[PDB]
Amino acid sequence: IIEPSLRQLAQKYNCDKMICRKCYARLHPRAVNCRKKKCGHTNNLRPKKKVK
Amino acid sequence: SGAKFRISLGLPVGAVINCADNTGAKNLYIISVKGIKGRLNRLPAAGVGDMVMATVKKGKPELRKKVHPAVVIRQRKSYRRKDGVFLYFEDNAGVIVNNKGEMKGSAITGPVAKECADLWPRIASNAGSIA
Amino acid sequence: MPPKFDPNEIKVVYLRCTGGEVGATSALAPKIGPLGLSPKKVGDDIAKKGLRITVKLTIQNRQAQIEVVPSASALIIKALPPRDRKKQKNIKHSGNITFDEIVNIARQMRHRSLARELSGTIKEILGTAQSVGCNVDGRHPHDIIDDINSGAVECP
Amino acid sequence: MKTILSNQTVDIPENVDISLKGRTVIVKGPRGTLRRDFNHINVELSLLGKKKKRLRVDKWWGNRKELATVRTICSHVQNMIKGVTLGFRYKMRSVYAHFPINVVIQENGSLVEIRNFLGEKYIRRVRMRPGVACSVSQAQKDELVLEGNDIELVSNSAALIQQATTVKNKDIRKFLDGIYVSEKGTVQQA
Amino acid sequence: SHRKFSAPRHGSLGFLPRKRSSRHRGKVKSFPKDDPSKPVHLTAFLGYKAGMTHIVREVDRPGSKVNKKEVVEAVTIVETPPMVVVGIVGYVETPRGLR
Amino acid sequence: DRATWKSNYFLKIIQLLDDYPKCFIVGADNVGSKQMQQIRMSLRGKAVVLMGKNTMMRKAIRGHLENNPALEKLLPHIRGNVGFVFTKEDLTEIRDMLLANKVPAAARAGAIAPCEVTVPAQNTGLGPEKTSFFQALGITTKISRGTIEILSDVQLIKTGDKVGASEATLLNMLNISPFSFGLIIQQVFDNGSIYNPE
RNA sequence: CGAUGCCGACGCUCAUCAGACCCCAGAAAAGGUGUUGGUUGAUAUAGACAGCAGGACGGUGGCCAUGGAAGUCGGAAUCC
RNA sequence: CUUCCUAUCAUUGUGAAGCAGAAUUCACCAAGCGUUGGAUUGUUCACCCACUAAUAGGGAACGUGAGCUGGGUUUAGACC
Ligand SMILES: [Zn+2]
C-alpha cells in the first residue's frame, strides 16, 4: 500500500527528470545542457514521459 | 529434481526406430533432436528419453508425410545408469507424442527404459513394464 | 460519498458542462454522483434553449442533487432558422436581443466574484463575463478599463 | 582573466576552535573533531581575531576554473562547522507497494539488511561509512536515521542503501518502491 | 574471405610449450597462502600411483535424482609411505623475487 | 523595469491618490493570489486597492521634492510588505474590516516557520478523504464527530521548522498557517496631516 | 643528432582519440552557459538580475467544436 | 585451419518508450565468447524443413591447388 506523500517523494527520484535526445542520459530536472561528452553537451532536451 | 544424467546418445539423425504404440505407425524417421545446440559438422544425437521430431515413413496414411514429435523409449546403444550397470535393450523404439508431452496412442508394447518413465509421466502411465 | 457513501460531510460541488442537449460528453447532470449512492435522477430533472453548453455548479447535501444553474449572466444570456452547427454567426446573436439591458439583472445579483467598486465595476465584469456578443456590438474591451471610478459613481 | 584577488571570509561560532596546519583544517566542537586536507587546490588560508573569530581564505592570480574553488573551500568548512556543532540527521523513508521492506540494523551502525524487497529472497546488506550510525526510527513506522558529524560520509552512506535497492528490468515509473531520502536536518536544530 | 561456417577452436593456447617436461615429478609452482592464525602444519605430500579400482557408497545430495542410492565411482590408489625430513631452507623477500 | 510599464506605474498610483481623498498604510503581508484577490474583493465596494513594486518607491523621490510633505517620516517604515488602499472610508473601518477577514492563505514550498499553531485533539474541518496523507509521517488519526479527528495534541508545529511540498498542503485544508499575520495598519496619511489610526 | 645548458618576450588549450610545419600522406554540413576574446540592444540608486514572498488566478469546461478538447485534434472566436 | 575487425544476432553491465507484466523495439562501454544439422543447384548467392540463447556482417593477393577435390568455366573427340 502506497500513500499520497510517498508517491510524490518517489516521483522526485524516478519520474521528474530531463532526458537528452542524442544520448538518452538522465539529467537533473532544471538542466538545459546534457552532462556527457559523448554527445557534445547538446541542448535538445525533452521531459521524461510520465505514465498514463 | 530435474536430473537427466548423461546417457550415451546412440540415435543420430537418420535413425529409423520401430514405433511402439497403437497409433498404427511402424517406423519413425528422426529428423532432428530437440534441445541440442550442436557444433560445426556434427549430427544431432537422440538418447533415451529425449523429445525428437520424427516423420512416420510406413503406416497409417493419415500419419505419414508430416512431422510428429516423438520420444525414444528403447535404444540399442549400451548406456550406463548411475550405479554401473550398462542396460541396453534389443531394438530402437519410440512413440508419437504431443509437444505438450502426452501420448497419442494408448497401448505401448514392450518394456520402457526407466529413464523415460521418470521424465514423461504420461508415458509411464501406459508402460507395460518399466525395465 | 464517492466509494460507498463514506461517513463524512459531503456538500460536493463540481464544474459540469453541457446543459440541455447531451453533447458528446454523453452526460448532463452528474460527474461524481452515481457511484456515491446519490442519484442523478433529480439532476436529470433540472437537465430538461440554450441547446448548448453551460457551466454548472451542482450541490449535493448528502442526499439531494439540487442542481443550480449559476447566476453568471453568460449562462443565462444565451438560454433566452434552426440554431444549427458550424456557426460562425458573428458572434452568436441575431443582433437584436437587447444586450445593454439583459446585463442589468446580472449586475444586481452577481455578488460572489471579481472585486467590485460601485456597480460600474460589476458592469465591466458582467459585460466581460459574457461571450454571446462580447460587449455589445463587436468593440471588445479596449479602453473601458478605467470606468471603475468614472462611470461607477455614475453607474446608479 | 587573471583576477588579482577574490577572497571569502568564514565567520565561525564562538563555541568552536579551528586550527590549520597550512591547508589541513581541523575543527573541533561539542561533538568531536574533523580533519580535512585541501591539497593540490592552491588557496592560502588565514585566520583573524581573538577566539578565532573569522577564517579568511585567499586566492591570488586566479583564472576562472581556478577561481571557483575559493568558495568551495569556504562551503565545506561551513559543513565542518555545522556538522560538529549541530550534527547531521538524514531522514529517509521506505516506500513499498508490493509487501513490506524488512530492514533490521544487525549491529550498532552497520549491516543494514533489507529483506523481502519486491518479494526477493536476497538479503541486501550494506555497511555504512565509519562513524555513521544507523537506527530504525522509533518516531515513525518506516524510517531509518543516519547520524554523523561529516556530510560526505553521512550523505554518501545514505546513497548506498538508496541505490542498493534498485528495481531492474521493470518500468521504473510504475514500480515505485525502495528506500528514498526525505529530510536533511541536524541533530539539534532550533 | 571469412570462414564460411563459424567453429570453436582446437586445443588450448594456455598450454603451449607442448613439449617434454624438464622435471620427472611434479613441481608445485605456488604453495597455499598461510593464514597465521592457524597452528603450523605441512602443505604437500609425495605419493606413488598404484592403479585404479571401484568403490560403492551412498549419497545424500538433497534434490538429486540419485539421493539415498548406491553409486559406483572409479578411484585411484596412491601409495604414500611416510617421508623423512632432512633439511631446512629459509626464504627472504626481495624486490626482484624470492631468494 | 520597462519604460511604459514604469510611466504607467507613475500614472496609476499618482491618479489614485488624487482620485480618492486619502490613502491608508495597510500591511499587505504574504498572502495567496486568489486569497489576496478576495482582499481586493472584500475591500472594494467604494474603494481602490493597489499593490506597487515600483509605484511605492516614488515616495522617496516625492519626499525630497516635498509634495504631500514629510514622507521621510514614513519611508524606511515599509520594511515588510505593507500597502496602500485608496478609499473614501475612515481610519477605523479600514483597520477592522481587514482584521475581520483574517485570510488563511495557502503557503509556499521550502519556506521557514517563525509562527506556530497549536494542534489540539479535536475536529476543525476535514471532509471526505483518507488519513493516509497524515499516515505518511506517522500520525494516525481516527474518524469521529464528522470530520477526521487528529488525536495528537503535542506541539507538532515549532519555530523555524522546514516545510515540504506536502507540508503546507496539510495546513491548507485544516486552514491553519505558520504565517498568520493578516492585514495590519499603524500609519495614516491625511492631506499633509500625518496620522496613525484613530 | 652538429646547434637555445637564452634563467628568451606576450598570450591561447585539457584532450578516457590532444597537437606538432610547403608539395604531404593532419575529413565535412552541423553543434557545445568547455574556454578567451569581440559586435549589437538593453537595466541599475523614479536601485539592479537572484533568493527569500505570493503562483498557472477566478466569472468559466468562456462561447463553441461536438471532432470526444476544464491549456491540447482543430474554431470566425479567445476578455475582464 | 589459424587470426583479425565492428558497422552487435545471442550473452554480462546499462540508458528510453505511446513500458502495467510477457514479448519488445532506439541507443551506450563492449569482439571475451558462441553464430548449427539437412533436400535442390558446380555454385558464391537463393529458397526451404528442424533445433536453438541468435542461427549478425566481414577482411587476410575477391586467405587457402608443391593442402585436396576438378562439379563449371576454358584446348583437343562429339550431339542439338
Ligand atoms: Zn546527451
Unique residue bearing C-alpha cell 502426452: B102
8-state DSSP, D178: E
Best residue in A1, A5, A6 to probe F by mutation, most F CBs within 10 Å? A5
CA dist., res. C146 & res. D115, Å (int): 69
Q: The dihedral of CA F164, F170, F175, F176: what is its sign?
A: negative
How many Å does it take to go from CA D65 to C1' G24? 39
8-state DSSP, A29: T
From B2, B39, B83, residue closest to E71, measured CB to CB: B83
Sheet containing strand D24-29, edge to edge, reads D17-20, D24-29, D32-37
Q: Determine contact, residues F134/F167, Cβ cutoff 8 Å.
A: no
* B128, C76, D47, E64 from D56: Cα distances, Å: 97, 72, 6, 73
CA dist., res. F162 & res. F137, Å (int): 14
Q: Determine contact, residues B92/B72, Cβ cutoff 8 Å.
A: yes
Residue nearest to nucleotide H2 (CA to C1'): E9
Rounded to the nearest 10 degrees, how much is the dihedral formed by the CA atoms of F104, F106, F108, F112? 20
Reference B92, options B105, B75, B109; nearest CA is B75
C-alpha cell, C26: 454523453
* C10, C14, C39, C42, E34 from C63: Cα distances, Å: 9, 16, 8, 10, 85
Residue spans of alpha helices (H) in chain B: 114-119, 121-126
Unique residue bearing C-alpha cell 617434454: E20
> Which nucleotide lies at the shortest CA–C1' distance from C50?
G63
Interface residues 62-101 of B with strand H (CB < 7 Å): 67
CA distance B43 to chain E (A): 15
CA distance D66 to chain A (A): 21
Q: Determine contact, residues F195/F92, Cβ cutoff 8 Å.
A: no
Burial (0-12, 13-18, 19+ Cβ within 10 Å), C29: buried
Which chains form contacts with chain A, at 3 or more CB pairs under 8 Å? D, F
Pairing mode of beta strands E75-79, E48-53: antiparallel
Unique residue bearing C-alpha cell 449572466: C73
C-alpha cell, B67: 512431422
Which distant-in-sequence residues (6+ apart) come within 8 Å of C156 by Cβ? C118, C119
**CA angle (E29 as vertex; E27, E35 as ends), nearest 5:** 120
Q: Determine contact, residues E52/E77, Cβ cutoff 8 Å.
A: yes
Which residues of A are less than 8 Å from F131 in CB distance? none
C-alpha cell, B54: 520424427
Which distant-in-sequence residues (6+ apart) come within 8 Å of D115 by Cβ? D101, D102, D103, D104, D123, D124
Q: The dihedral of CA B27, B30, B34, B36: what is its sign?
A: positive
CA dist., res. B57 & res. B50, Å (int): 20
Backbone phi, then psi, for D158, in 5-degree steps? -75, -40
CA dist., res. F182 & res. F174, Å (int): 17
Resolution in A: 3.5
Which distant-in-sequence residues (6+ apart) come within 8 Å of B26 by Cβ? B18, B19, B56, B58, B59
* C20, C136, E28 from C26: Cα distances, Å: 12, 33, 88
Pairing mode of beta strands D44-48, D112-115: unpaired
Q: Does F109 touch chain A (CB under 8 A)?
A: no
* B15, B101, C75, F174 from C49: Cα distances, Å: 87, 71, 11, 42
From F40, F46, F146, residue closest to C118, measured CB to CB: F46
CA dist., res. C10 & res. D30, Å (int): 55
Phi-psi bin for B101: left (phi > 0), alpha (psi -120 to 50), beta? left
Question: Which CB contacts under 8 angstroms, 24+ apart, belong to F77-82?
Answer: F77/F25, F77/F187, F78/F25, F80/F27, F80/F29, F81/F27, F81/F28, F81/F29, F81/F30, F82/F25, F82/F26, F82/F27, F82/F28, F82/F29, F82/F184, F82/F187
Widest Cα–Cα separation across chain C: 55
Unique residue bearing C-alpha cell 508431452: B101
F and A make contact (3+ CB pairs below 8 Å): yes
Half-sphere exposure at residue F39, Cβ-oriented, CA atoms within 13 angstroms:
27
Reference F171, options F89, F105, F73; nearest CA is F105
* B17, D18, D36 from D13: Cα distances, Å: 94, 10, 19
Residue type, B104: K
CA dist., res. D27 & res. D35, Å (int): 7
CA dist., res. F71 & res. F61, Å (int): 10
Best residue in C117, C145, C154 to probe F by mutation, most F CBs within 10 Å? C117
Q: Determine contact, residues D88/D186, Cβ cutoff 8 Å.
A: yes
The answer to whether F137 contacts A5, with C-beta atoms less than 8 Å apart, is yes
* D163, F31, F97, F180, F190 from F184: Cα distances, Å: 50, 13, 11, 11, 18
